[PDB]
């Protein structure tokens, strides 16, 4: 602390007034970093307020100055401006008043729909739940996609990474998961309701506006909170936005309800955090990232948990998004998030342009919850599907130069081709779990071997309609039983053969 | 003495003392703090200022806050009172079962046992895993490393080793959860309770758990491995027991040291790491050893970043282990579980004079067929299977039978797959692979060798396939 | 999308020789001819 005014008043023995323990003055300001002299009673990661009305967070506490990141444009901050302590660390509004609202990283509404009447505020940096308060992940979290709910299942309380290149369908997976919860939120079952939270980090405001337009048209906005820290916002806002959205989802998790968080995308939050660390003169590491960039994502995603029945039983499900560069998952940030999350959904550009949409690489996509994240009917049909897809994987290569094949092998090749075309699905149309089970069950029991793969989608709509208004007793029978009995299997096969004769 | 906080930058806190300075590795406690934040002295900066790393979150720290020197390093409770309990990095009970009432405390920093105290006993530890027992057999009292990337099966393998060894071991066991998922720690804690290894009523608990997970700061994740090691060292030394030390994951000890090393004023090393990587790993690993007083059988899961075994953290760990089992993604993608690479996993007791001549010759014979299989695959790609001659036909056919037979269903993975778990004696493993090498089962299909424990189940599965088809 | 055999070691499907580790289409050719022979045998 040796500046010319402070040095000179130390020579005179003036003992100056305006004591700098709850206040301070800016020494240097630039690139969103303000070095402030004073603020002696300040706390680490504490909010401050500048004389221009802007807010800031004190990250570096040093004997001479305080390193403060600026929540906005630093053109308003000037050298010698008065910085005041807020007195508390960063907190955001929480509650159900934020459902249907678009907010920034600090909780201020940006959709122009008026003030938010929230009653409670939680600090964004709470500690994750421990070993005791959480229970094993057991409830299915329905994405609505056949390739996800069967092969890479997601349970309530699980971090599942959606990783891929640019324009591979990562946002498509996340938005369709939010849209799929319309069925459960309309129903009377309070246990199966899911309140989604979408966090947009570093995107365009027109991209976020297109997201809100899609969610409002599908009426998914009533249970969705959109936290938006776009590219025009400051790097501290984009860094703070996943923790703000996590705190909003932690309100539902701690109150017995089930919430879903999408961080779209965490690769941009690392870029924002790298910019703050470099401009705070902290020494960089791999790809100029700070050392604590792993702890950045680990302390965020660990707060996604399935609480025990003594803590209300609520869950917090996280779907982080990571963008790779030409499929390089050996980079610093994709490697960290893969090692943190409970599973991955790899999306490949080669599969995307081969017609496979969603472009999920089944050989690279894992899920550490396994069959416990699936319902009983889905577990019965996805296990048989995983065996048949494994058998198809052994025999799918024969189309390269093979010409004569065994009759059983040809049946395996034909059924697996039907299954690969079964896993394809259009965008913005998530299907219910009963429809996914029924279509997959027909695919793995040979009910589609006589159908050309080009008409699989037409069969998927029309046959499901036929067993909906006419054979709804069978659907009630499966729902009450919870699985597929041999008698129900024979009944469904007879309806399939009757429908194929009429087809 | 008493000090005051000078700087707070990340997980690194600089504190200044007026009286005599605390030594390096001493434990400092922040006074105006509710969850008992503890700082560990890392270096003396001069001008009566020491630089520390925090064992908990640093939010809300104020420059000028009083810090108290405990006069000693981090001391944790040790003894039988830690059995069936969960401890954090600083020894506080995090299982919500009240305080750990005990009379014995041990510092988590200690010198490694000397060269005079080293034991050269090497006897094979039978695990029931066919690829482990045959190709890279574990030794009692030796160090075991489970190398692998993300999702290859290190956690499932270390859960299977706990099920097969620690349930009927005889003597205490210690699990150290270092920088992993809290869900996995909750899953293991309830699996131990259901298995009876943890008793919530009686004093018959066998395993002591120490957990510092991904949500912990880098200071806690870089010292929680020393906390679990201190519990294992007390059981080895002050009780003479045989100790099982399961660590998952030991890479997080290295990674958490690299996160704070930039803020400690260090130039980065190659790839990007602390310059003290080999020394910090060496001081930690050489405490985990079999003394002449007692034996510690250590099984450590080792994360391989981006499946690059030439990364400095897995590469330095190789020299510290008697047996290394490398889990490969290529093996796992074929459906083979466990995904142990047969041509990348080594053991020190893989000797004719330790495991016998028949065990050694079959293991070397298996590795020779699998190596010739990799060499022949390029000819198969170009020339095709039509032009290979009957010798290479039998090499490829027996290699696929061997490669399928290395897979095995795990009891801890039964909920994942549905296959019942199977435990295979070492004698049945040697006999089973000898039959495939001799060519006694050349008429069997290769699907009969997939996910079956003994070779008698291979014959039964082949008969079932033939009868059904 | 299933990680076809011979597409690459660690790339979804593969494991074996240099061609199978490299993946692409020659690893697919190696897996195709090998699996065709052993399916003919069974």
């Amino acid at each position: 602390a040796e500046i010319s005014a402070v040095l000179e008043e130390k020579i005179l023995g003036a003992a100056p007034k305006e004591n700098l323990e709850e206040t301070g003055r800016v020494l240097s300001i630039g690139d969103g970093i303000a070095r402030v002299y004073g603020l002696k009673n300040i706390q680490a990661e504490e909010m401050v307020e500048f004389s221009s009305g802007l807010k800031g967070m004190a990250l570096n506490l040093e004997p001479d100055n305080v390193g403060i990141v600026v929540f906005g444009n630093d053109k308003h901050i000037k050298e010698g401006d008065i910085v005041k302590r807020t007195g508390a660390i960063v907190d955001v509004p929480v509650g159900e008043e934020l459902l249907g609202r678009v907010v920034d990283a600090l909780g201020n509404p940006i959709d122009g729909k008026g003030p938010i009447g929230s009653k409670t505020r939680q600090r964004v940096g709470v500690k994750a739940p421990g070993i005791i308060p959480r229970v094993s992940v057991r409830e299915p979290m329905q994405t609505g996609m056949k390739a996800v709910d069967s092969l890479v299942p997601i349970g309530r309380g699980q971090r599942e990474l959606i990783i891929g290149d640019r324009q591979t369908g990562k946002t498509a997976i996340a938005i369709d998961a939010i849209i799929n919860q319309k069925r459960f939120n309309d129903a009377q079952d309070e246990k199966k309701k899911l309140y989604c939270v979408y966090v947009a980090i570093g995107q365009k405001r027109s991209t976020v506006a297109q997201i809100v337009k899609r969610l409002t048209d599908t009426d998914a906005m009533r249970y969705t909170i959109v936290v938006s820290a776009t590219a025009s916002d400051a790097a501290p806002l984009q860094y703070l936005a996943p923790y703000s959205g996590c705190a909003m989802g932690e309100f539902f998790r701690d109150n017995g309800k089930h919430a879903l968080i999408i961080y779209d995308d965490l690769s941009k939050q690392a870029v924002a955090y790298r910019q703050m660390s470099l401009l705070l003169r902290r020494p960089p590491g791999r790809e100029a990232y700070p050392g604590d960039v792993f702890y950045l994502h680990s302390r965020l995603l660990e707060r996604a948990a399935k609480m025990s029945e003594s803590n209300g039983g609520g869950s917090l499900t996280a779907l982080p998004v990571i963008e790779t560069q030409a499929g390089d998952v050996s980079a610093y940030i994709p490697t960290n998030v893969i090692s943190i999350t409970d599973g991955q959904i790899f999306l490949e550009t080669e599969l995307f342009y081969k017609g496979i949409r969603p472009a999920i690489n089944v050989g690279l996509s894992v899920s550490r919850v396994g069959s416990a994240a699936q319902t009983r009917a889905m577990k019965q049909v996805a296990g048989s599907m995983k065996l048949e897809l494994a058998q198809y994987r052994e025999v799918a290569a024969f189309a390269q130069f093979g010409s004569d094949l065994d009759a059983s092998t040809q049946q395996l090749l034909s059924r697996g081709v039907r299954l690969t075309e079964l896993l394809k699905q259009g965008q913005y149309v998530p299907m219910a779990i009963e429809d996914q089970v029924a279509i997959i069950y027909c695919g793995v029991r040979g009910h589609l071997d006589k159908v050309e793969p080009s008409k699989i989608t037409k069969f998927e709509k029309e046959f499901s309609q036929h067993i909906k208004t006419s054979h709804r007793d069978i659907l009630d029978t499966i729902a009450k039983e919870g699985q597929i009995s041999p008698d129900t299997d024979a009944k469904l096969k007879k309806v399939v053969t009757d429908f194929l004769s009429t087809f | 003495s008493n000090g005051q906080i000078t700087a707070v930058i990340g997980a690194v806190v600089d504190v200044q003392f007026e009286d005599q300075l605390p030594p390096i590795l001493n434990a400092l406690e922040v006074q105006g703090r509710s969850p008992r934040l503890i700082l560990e002295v890392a270096q003396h900066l001069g001008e009566n200022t020491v630089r520390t790393i925090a064992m908990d979150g640093t939010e809300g720290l104020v420059r000028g806050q009083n810090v108290l020197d405990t006069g000693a390093p981090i001391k944790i409770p040790v003894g039988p009172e830690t059995l069936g309990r969960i401890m954090n990095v600083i020894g506080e009970p995090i299982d919500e079962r009240g305080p750990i009432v005990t009379d014995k405390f041990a510092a988590i920093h200690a010198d490694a046992p000397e060269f005079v105290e080293m034991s050269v006993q090497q006897e094979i530890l039978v695990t029931g895993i066919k690829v482990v027992d045959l190709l890279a057999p574990y030794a009692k009292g030796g160090k075991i490393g489970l190398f692998g990337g993300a999702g290859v099966g290190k956690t499932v393998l270390i859960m299977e080793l706990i099920n097969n060894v620690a349930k009927a071991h005889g003597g205490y066991s210690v699990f150290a959860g270092v920088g992993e998922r809290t869900r996995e720690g909750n899953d293991l804690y309830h699996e131990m309770i259901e298995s009876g290894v943890i008793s919530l009523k009686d004093k018959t608990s066998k395993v002591a758990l120490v957990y510092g997970q991904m949500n912990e700061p880098p200071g806690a994740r870089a010292r929680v491995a020393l906390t679990g090691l201190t519990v294992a060292e007390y059981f080895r030394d002050q009780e003479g027991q045989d100790v099982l030390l399961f660590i998952d994951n030991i890479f997080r000890f290295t990674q958490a040291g690299s996160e704070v090393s930039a803020l400690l004023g260090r130039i980065p090393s190659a790839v990007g790491y602390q310059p003290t990587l080999a020394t910090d790993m060496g001081t930690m690993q050489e405490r985990i050893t079999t003394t002449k007083k007692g034996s510690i059988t250590s099984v450590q899961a080792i994360y391989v970043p981006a499946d690059d075994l030439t990364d400095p953290a897995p590469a330095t760990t190789f020299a510290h282990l008697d047996a290394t089992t490398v889990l490969s993604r290529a093996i796992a993608e074929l459906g083979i579980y466990p995904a142990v690479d047969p041509l990348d996993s080594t053991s020190r007791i893989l000797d004719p004079n330790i495991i016998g001549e028949e065990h050694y010759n079959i293991a070397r014979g298996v590795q020779k067929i699998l190596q010739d299989y990799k060499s022949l695959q390029d000819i198969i790609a170009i020339l095709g299977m039509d032009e290979l001659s009957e010798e290479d036909k039998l090499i490829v056919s027996r290699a696929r039978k061997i490669q399928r037979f290395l897979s095995q269903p795990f009891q801890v993975a039964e909920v994942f797959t549905g296959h019942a778990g199977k435990l295979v004696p070492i004698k049945d493993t040697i006999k089973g692979f000898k039959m495939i090498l001799n060519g006694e089962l050349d008429h069997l299909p290769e699907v009969a060798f997939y996910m079956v424990g003994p070779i008698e189940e291979v014959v039964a599965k082949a008969e079932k396939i033939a009868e059904s088809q | 999308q299933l990680g076809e055999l011979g597409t690459g070691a660690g790339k979804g499907g593969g494991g074996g020789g240099s061609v199978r580790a490299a993946g692409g289409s020659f690893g697919r050719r190696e897996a195709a001819e090998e699996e065709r022979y052993f399916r003919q045998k069974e």
Partner: peptide
Amino acid sequence: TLKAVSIRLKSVKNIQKITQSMKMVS
């Protein structure tokens, strides 16, 4: 990456050796 190119270069080198050997025989 560097490892991917090294693996691919090793495979193509083995392909050339086999085809050169096949060319001499044929």
